Amino acid sequence: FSDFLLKEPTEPKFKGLRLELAVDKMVTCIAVGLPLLLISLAFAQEISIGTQISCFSPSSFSWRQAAFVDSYCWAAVQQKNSLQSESGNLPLWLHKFFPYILLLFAILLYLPPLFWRFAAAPHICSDLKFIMEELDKVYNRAIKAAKPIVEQYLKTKKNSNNLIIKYISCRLLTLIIILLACIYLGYYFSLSSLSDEFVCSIKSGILRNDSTVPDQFQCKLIAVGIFQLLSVINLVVYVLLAPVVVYTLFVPFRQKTDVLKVYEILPTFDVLHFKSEGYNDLSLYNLFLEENISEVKSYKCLKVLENI
Amino acid sequence: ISLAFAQEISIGTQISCFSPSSFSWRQAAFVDSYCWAAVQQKNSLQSE
Amino acid sequence: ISLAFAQEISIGTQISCFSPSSFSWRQAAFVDSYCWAAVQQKNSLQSESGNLPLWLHKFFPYILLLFAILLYLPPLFWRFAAAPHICSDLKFIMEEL
Amino acid sequence: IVEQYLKTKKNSNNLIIKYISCRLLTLIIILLACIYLGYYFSLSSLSDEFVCSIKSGILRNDSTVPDQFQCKLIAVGIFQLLSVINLVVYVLLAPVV
């Protein structure tokens, strides 16, 4: 009990706070930023050196007939009419549309943070600002006496489940999308065959019953050997990222019930009630506050007291 | 639309016709341009 | 990497093979594309003692960019994990002095 | 009050281990990049030339394709120079770390 500095009231408070946790923004950062990076690198090298397909046409063909054979056999991996590799026809379908599927997973790994921004941002923002102003004002009356409203609010949030289920649902959606991307990339690398080569035929329309076109063409898909490398490194990153996402589901486990242990030195609080050990909104606030304690200077001023 | 335009301007044209080998390059380009511009009018397309 | 990509897209391709004179233009382009795409699989390359150098020569800029990315994550972790604590403690000790 | 705060920080280890772990991660990534670039320059052979073959699918049992092709990788001689200067810079940077 001595003299300590009082806190002036200021209106521009906290310069905007952390509406997301630390490791969750990092996880969505890496999990959306990796496949877009791989897609951009693949498109740069593909538009630099090479086409997507190349077929071996006879020497008596002109240039435009060889270009027709390339365009026809590129456009005819969809329909299963005559490709002579129907056991691996679905790999031939996947080899054309791999970057579209990778970009689709990159888009679907972005919607749960957008829903968290449009649905859970201003409620947690206003509640954090209110509890911070309440702590800042309840510290100022402590030194004037030396010259419980939060204890009921933390009971109010004890019996409510309206934000923790939203947080858990967003994390579970992110986890199952991660697992589906993992099994898809594992399958696409696990084909791994000589499935880039196939046999195409152009005798379909009035070119049937001809004697100039040679009835068989050997075609090869060029960009498969880069796609398999991209799938390997993306699979390795997502497998190393999955234990973090299963670790951030145990909300009452990775919390410490001493974020307001320092405030019982002030004789008015007697704040000891944090025996939650459960899945209430109090256990979510107990972790959303512990990262955000760097904007109450009363906490820093009280940190010097109990250790001497 | 942006993804389709990127892949279309990357790899491929819109149409390709199979002209005989005795044609030159510009005659094959004429056949491509003509049969691309003639899907509007229904004169002789055999798939009416 | 940027200088190498500028000079590579300026003057040259990545591979060039010597096809016979009776081939047309598109058959020579097929031979180039095929032998560029077939340095991965070890079927018939006749230099299997140095096959891993042939694999590395294609993917050198990817590996160099991967090391450039992995040399960036520890400052990002220091920014997301050790910045505001040291910031507030420095401001407090400065105001105290 | 500062004479007790500097005793408070005297018995805590929560930021120095984070700083040391970030520097050690940076050092081992630097050393792995150094040994990789050293190996890639140390191959240095005539490994840019190789012999390719296209007789794989229905082109097997043919009489027009000439069964052997001499191919050469073009951009190797620039990559070796880039690896040399990157290795020299990282070796001079390791004593600072």
Numbering used by the authors:
A (entry chain A): 12 to 158, 194 to 354
B (entry chain D): 50 to 97
C (entry chain F): 50 to 146
D (entry chain F): 195 to 291
Sentences from the paper on this structure:
Pannexin 1 (PANX1) plays extensive physiological roles across diverse fields of biology, including cell death, inflammation, cancer progression, and neurological disorders. As suggested by biochemical analysis, PANX1 forms an oligomeric channel for the facilitated diffusion of ions and large molecules across the plasma membrane upon activation. The overall structure of human PANX1 presents a novel heptameric assembly, which is distinct from gap junction channels (connexins and innexins)8,9 and functionally related channels, such as CALHM and LRRC8. Interestingly, the protomer of PANX1 shares a similar fold of four transmembrane helices with the aforementioned channels.
We purified full-length human PANX1 and solved the structure using cryo-EM. Among the classes of 2D particle images, the images representing the top views or bottom views exhibited seven obvious subunits in each detergent micelle. This observation differs from the previously proposed hexameric assembly of PANX1.7 Finally, the map was refined to 3.1 Å resolution. The model we built contained an almost intact extracellular region, transmembrane domain, and partial intracellular region. Three fractions (N-terminal, 1–12; 158–193, between TM2 and TM3; and C-terminal, 355–426) were missing in the final model. Thus, the structure of full-length PANX1 was employed for the following structural analysis due to its clearer density map. As the result shows, the radius of the narrowest constrictive site is ~4.7 Å, which is contributed by W74. I58 from the tail of TM1 forms a larger hydrophobic ring. We discovered a shrink ring formed by residues (T21/E22/P23) in the N-terminus. However, disordered CT tails are missing in the structure of full-length PANX1. Given that the pore is more than 9 Å wide, an open conformation of PANX1 was probably captured.
